[PDB]
Design a binder for this molecule. Structure first.
Ligand SMILES: Nc1ncnc2c1ncn2[C@@H]1O[C@H](COP(=O)(O)OP(=O)(O)O)[C@@H](O)[C@H]1O
Ligand SMILES: Cc1onc(-c2c(Cl)cccc2Cl)c1CO
Ligand SMILES: [Cl-]
Ligand SMILES: [Cl-]
Ligand SMILES: [Mg+2]
Ligand SMILES: [Mg+2]
Length: 265
C-alpha cells in the first residue's frame, strides 16, 4: 500500500536506540502524523526483528484514549517505516526537565491515566515492561498516552534479550532473569510516582552494579516533603514479592489518589 513518496517530511521529533522519529504530512489528505524510521542493518545486527513485529501487532489492535495508535507500516531495502499518531505536546520526560518536580495534583492525575490504560492492557494479558518518562507522550489536551510497545509480551514470561539501557524502572524478578507477569508494570508505576514528586527515581546510582544492588534490596528513602498519603501508596507498590503488590482497582481507589487527581476511572 503506502510508500515513502506519499509523504512530506518535517522536523525531527526524537531519537531512540533504534527509532528516529519525524513529523510528516500525507499528500492527498494533508494528514499530520509521526513516522518512526528504523534501519534494517541495525535491526539485523542486534537481532531485534521480533521486537518490531510485536510492536506493530499489539499497538494496532488496541483502542484506548490513553494509548498511542499505530496506523500502518512499509519498508524499502534500507529501512522499515511505522506510521504513528502525532503527540503535539511532547514527552513527560521533557516536562519533568522543565519543572524539576510535579505537584500532588499533576502527579495523581498522571498516575490515574496510566492505571486506566494498563488496566485495559492487562485485561488482554498484555504486559508493557518498559514504562518510563521517554515513552509517555502528551495529547493536545495534556492527557497522557503510552507508546513504544517494543518490549511488550503475553504473560507469564521469561526474559528474551540483553538489557540495553537503564535498570531504574525494573522490578527485582526481571533484572535477576526470573519469571515475571503483570506485576512488573505495577512496580514501575511506584517507581514513576516517586520520580514525579521528588525529581529523580528511588534507586538511582552511579554505576550499573550498584543500581542493581539497591533495586534487589529495595533501598529507598523519602525526603521530608513527601506527605503520608504519598508514602503509603509508593510503599505498597514497591514490595519485593510481586503477589504482595496491589491490584489496579486498589491504586485507582486509594484515598490519596481520589483526593488529588482531576480525572475519573
Ligand atoms: N508519536 C510521537 N510524537 C512525538 N514524538 C515522538 C513520537 N514517538 C516518539 N517520539 C519521540 O521520539 C522518541 C523515541 O521514540 P520511541 O518509539 O520510544 O523509539 P525507541 O523504541 O527506539 O525508543 C520518544 O522518546 C519521543 O521523544
Ligand atoms: C510487521 C513487520 O514489522 N517489521 C517487519 C520487518 C520487515 Cl517489513 C522487514 C525486515 C524486518 C522486519 Cl521485523 C514486518 C514484516 O514482517
Ligand atoms: Cl486518513
Ligand atoms: Cl485491578
Ligand atoms: Mg522508547
Ligand atoms: Mg523500542
Amino acid at each position: 500500500q503506502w510508500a515513502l513518496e506519499d509523504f512530506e517530511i518535517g522536523r525531527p521529533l526524537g531519537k531512540g536506540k533504534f527509532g528516529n522519529v519525524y513529523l510528516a504530512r500525507e499528500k492527498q489528505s494533508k494528514f499530520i502524523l509521526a513516522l518512526k524510521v528504523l534501519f534494517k542493518a541495525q535491526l539485523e545486527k542486534a537481532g531485534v526483528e521480533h521486537q518490531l513485529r510485536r510492536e506493530v501487532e499489539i499497538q494496532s489492535h488496541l483502542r484506548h484514549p490513553n494509548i498511542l495508535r499505530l496506523y500502518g507500516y512499509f519498508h524499502d531495502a534500507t529501512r522499515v517505516y511505522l506510521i504513528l499518531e502525532y503527540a503535539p505536546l511532547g514527552t513527560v520526560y521533557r516536562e519533568l526537565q522543565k519543572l524539576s518536580k510535579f505537584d500532588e495534583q499533576r502527579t495523581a492525575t498522571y498516575i490515574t491515566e496510566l492505571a486506566n490504560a494498563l488496566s485495559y492492557c492487562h485485561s488482554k494479558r498484555v504486559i508493557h515492561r518498559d514504562i518510563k518518562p521517554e515513552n509517555l507522550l502528551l495529547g493536545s489536551a495534556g492527557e497522557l498516552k503510552i507508546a513504544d510497545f517494543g518490549w511488550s509480551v503475553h504473560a507469564p514470561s521469561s526474559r528474551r534479550t540483553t538489557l540495553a539501557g537503564t535498570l531504574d524502572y525494573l522490578p527485582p524478578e526481571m533484572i535477576e532473569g526470573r519469571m515475571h507477569d503483570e506485576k512488573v508494570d505495577l512496580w514501575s508505576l511506584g517507581v514513576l510516582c516517586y520520580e514525579f514528586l521528588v525529581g529523580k527515581p528511588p534507586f538511582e546510582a552511579n554505576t550499573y552494579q550498584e543500581t542493581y544492588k539497591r533495586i534487589s534490596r529495595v533501598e529507598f528513602t523519602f525526603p521530608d516533603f513527601v506527605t503520608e498519603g504519598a508514602r503509603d501508596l509508593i510503599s505498597r507498590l514497591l514490595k519485593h514479592n510481586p503477589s504482595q503488590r496491589p491490584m489496579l482497582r486498589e491504586v485507582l481507589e486509594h484515598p490519596w489518589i481520589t483526593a488529588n487527581s482531576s480525572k475519573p476511572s
